Design a protein around this nucleic acid. Structure first.
Lengths: 98, 91, 219, 55
RNA sequence: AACACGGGAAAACUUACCAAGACCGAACAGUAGAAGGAAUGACAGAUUAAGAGUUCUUUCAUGAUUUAUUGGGUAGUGGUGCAUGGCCGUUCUUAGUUGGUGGAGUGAUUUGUCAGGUUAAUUCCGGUAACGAACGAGACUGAAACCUAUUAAUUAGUUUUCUGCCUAUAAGACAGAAAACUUCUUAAAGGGACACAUUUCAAAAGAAAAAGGAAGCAUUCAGCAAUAACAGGUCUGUGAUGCCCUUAGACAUCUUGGGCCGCACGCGCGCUACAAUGGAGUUACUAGAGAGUACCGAGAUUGAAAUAGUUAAGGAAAACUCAAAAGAACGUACAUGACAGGGAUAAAUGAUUGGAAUUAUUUGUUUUGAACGAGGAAUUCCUUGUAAUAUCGAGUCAUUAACUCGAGAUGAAUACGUCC
């Protein structure tokens, strides 16, 4: 199995990154290490004014995407059963079967 | 305005059978559900709020209509539905 | 007969099976903004006071933090909201539902607090006294401080604006991101528009301490 | 036809075929990341969407 | 604090202007008329740019969806930003603003909020009818500058091994997997500079040299950013909005064409040049940071002289695409010559995008070979990986940068000063 987690909050995925790893001790024997794929900042630059007047000013918005990848052998039927765990809003969990 | 004769009844039941209907304020495309220009849908049911059949909440260039209490009575005489045919706070 | 070929779709990018990681989170936040501003125009009388987009992997849980759940008869209004979402965003009927919670800290919510002034102003209560009653609820609700700004044609044709402050409030810094709670509301009048901006300085209960602090204990 | 010629011009390339999602403006659009939100409107909901003015 | 600004690089739309043509986007309420037809669409020929039946001679289909009527909303990139909300700019990027009690004054008001010193800073030492506080500054947040200590290891790298190949005189190179670690890579957590440590200078806040250190000007660059105010810009971004105006021959809506590109001239922002610290012909190069769906970024095989054409993998991406020139090395070339510097303006021709390229969209081949010989008064930006020089990615984008926002590549001089 391969667990891929991505979210805008670093501590949201990081807390859940160790939640699956700790959970792997039961109904299983091992979970591979967390791979920290480089982040992807989403920079959008806009003019502050709603018109052409004023000085030339800009604001630099940005959003970061944090990617973590986990590996684990187990069984497809009982990998995590529910595999929901009431994940926090803003986080996404995708499981790559086989 | 002048809508297709079979279309007026078709759009009416869709609202009655669901109690809620959306539309796009843009007047260059067709309605994906009814397969007709949004001008017909907007023009026809912008007056259902003048008759107090629905409400007139519009958000993000989309207008939303929700069946009212007086909407059921009006949408029964025209639609020729039985009295017991009620959405019953569900549709 | 119409010579129209374009067909604007009724969907949302958060339902697409294949999408980039950059596009997914942008679409995830874009959906909330349209959705949050949607039922705000509907549950303004009910004090919507927030939305949430919690997900359990497959099912979509929509949470409304309304401050007044008296209106929401066997969930008739709740059911009507779902019907609009299906027609608009094309959600499956089995994969979306609406939950409502009653916020215990009524005063601490600026979104619903600003609706009290908007209601009272339209009723004819003086702006000097309407805010004073509203400001009273915020102060004893555990809020460190707040600032209510009213601008428009309050007195006469010439625009005037009064700013009311109470309690401690830090105006500059990054810490203001983790302690501010703001809302902007506007009420149409017989002569124009009154602009109400309501913000609230929170306390340590939204966990996180202020920048400068020593608080040395004793022995 | 009274409406056959109505809106008969093809607009499929896009300056008058794309509009802001809420404002509906045709100028200042931000098509990056599939935003489809023109400026003066994205700035209103920038923090709401998730963008923050960091460095 | 107007003038590559309205993210405004306008063929159509945008579009607000102009010549035409239509057209209701006149809901709802009362009347007339009407399923024994209110009205709607149309083939032909004429009219019209037009295959808008707009209209006309004309019959062919459907039928209350409403055709004529008063109220009425309505719609407007119409006016008013001297009616307004929001946002932004500006005073103002510096260090400033205040109420609680107390003291002074009849009162407007004042003290606190200062003699001196010091700081980037009402930042502090100190002084004290002031005391105790609130905001601003600082603090705080993002990137950079370090972790042979920790955590991990593919889509990152290194090493080993097996197979094949090739050159050496003896090192290894290359191609296909195989599997081991984390110095580099990536990303988490803590650690790590507080000027403490020395000398000097100023019972003090503090200042300078030098040392060590990845890092010593608040370490550097940015974000946030006080009270009060403008009758600064925006109602042409908004379904934010009051009042006024037009409101079925319309300033509402749609279509065709044109204009925003129009040239006697003046001004602002820029690109390229005036060359030998160079242009032209070859050769090896070394980056960083962006973007990509069903049809988006497009690999590989081909013909062509190039622009581009035909078939087409993998890739929702540390996976695949996506790639560096200034500079350098090579030659008995150029040789001080408006020359081979300069590429303007023109003339033939070839393709891509587009429904449409004419007033050339963009670009290929050949020819045409203009001013410009370093630039008056004036005047702008800049103190360190900064200026300058040349380039790369992205926003606009069907196609179109000399723009802007970012990114790396080489790497000056001059100050450690004073209010002229």
């Amino acid at each position: 199995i391969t667990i891929t987690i991505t979210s805008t909050k670093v501590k949201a995925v990081e807390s859940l990154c160790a939640e699956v790893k700790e959970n792997g001790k039961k109904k299983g024997v091992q979970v591979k290490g967390p791979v920290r794929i480089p982040t992807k900042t989403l920079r959008i630059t806009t003019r502050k004014t709603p018109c052409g007047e004023g000085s030339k000013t800009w604001d630099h918005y940005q959003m970061r995407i944090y990617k973590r990848v986990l590996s684990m052998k187990t069984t497809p039927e009982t990998v995590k059963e529910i595999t929901s765990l009431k994940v926090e809003p803003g986080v996404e969990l995708e499981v790559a079967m086989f | 305005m002048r809508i297709a004769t079979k279309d007026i009844i078709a759009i009416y039941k869709q609202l009655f059978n669901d109690g809620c209907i959306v539309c796009h304020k843009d007047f260059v495309c067709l309605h994906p559900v009814f397969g007709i220009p949004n001008l017909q849908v907007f023009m026809l049911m912008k007056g259902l709020a003048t008759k107090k059949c629905v409400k007139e909440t519009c958000n993000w260039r989309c207008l939303y209509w929700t069946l009212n209490d007086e909407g059921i009575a009006y949408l029964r005489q025209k639609l020729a539905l039985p009295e017991d045919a009620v959405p019953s706070t569900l549709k | 007969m119409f010579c129209l070929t374009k067909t604007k779709a009724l969907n949302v990018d958060v339902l697409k099976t294949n999408i980039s990681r950059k596009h997914k989170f942008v679409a995830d936040g874009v959906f909330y903004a349209e959705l949050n501003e949607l039922l705000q125009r509907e549950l303004s009388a009910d004090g919507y006071s927030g939305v949430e987009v919690r997900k359990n992997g497959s099912k979509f849980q929509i949470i409304i933090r309304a401050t007044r759940t008296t209106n929401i008869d066997k969930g008739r209004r709740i059911h009507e909201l779902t019907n609009l979402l299906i027609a608009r965003f094309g959600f499956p009927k089995d994969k979306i539902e609406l939950y409502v919670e009653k916020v215990l800290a009524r005063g601490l919510c600026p979104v619903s607090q600003a609706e009290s002034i908007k209601y009272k102003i339209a009723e004819g209560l003086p702006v000097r006294r309407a805010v004073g009653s509203v400001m009273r609820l915020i102060m004893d609700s555990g809020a460190k401080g707040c600032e209510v700004s009213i601008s428009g044609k309050l007195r006469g044709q010439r625009a005037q604006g009064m700013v009311f402050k109470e309690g401690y409030m830090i105006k500059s810094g990054n810490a203001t991101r983790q302690f501010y709670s703001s809302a902007v509301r506007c009420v149409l009048l017989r002569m124009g528009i009154i602009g109400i901006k309501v913000t609230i300085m929170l306390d340590t209960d939204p966990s996180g301490k202020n920048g400068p602090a020593a608080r040395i204990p004793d022995v | 036809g009274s409406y056959s010629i109505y809106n008969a011009h093809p607009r499929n390339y896009g300056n008058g075929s794309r509009t802001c999602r809420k404002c509906g403006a045709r100028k200042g659009l931000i098509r990056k990341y599939g935003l489809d939100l023109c400026r003066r409107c994205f700035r209103e909901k920038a923090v709401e969407i998730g963008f923050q003015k960091l460095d």
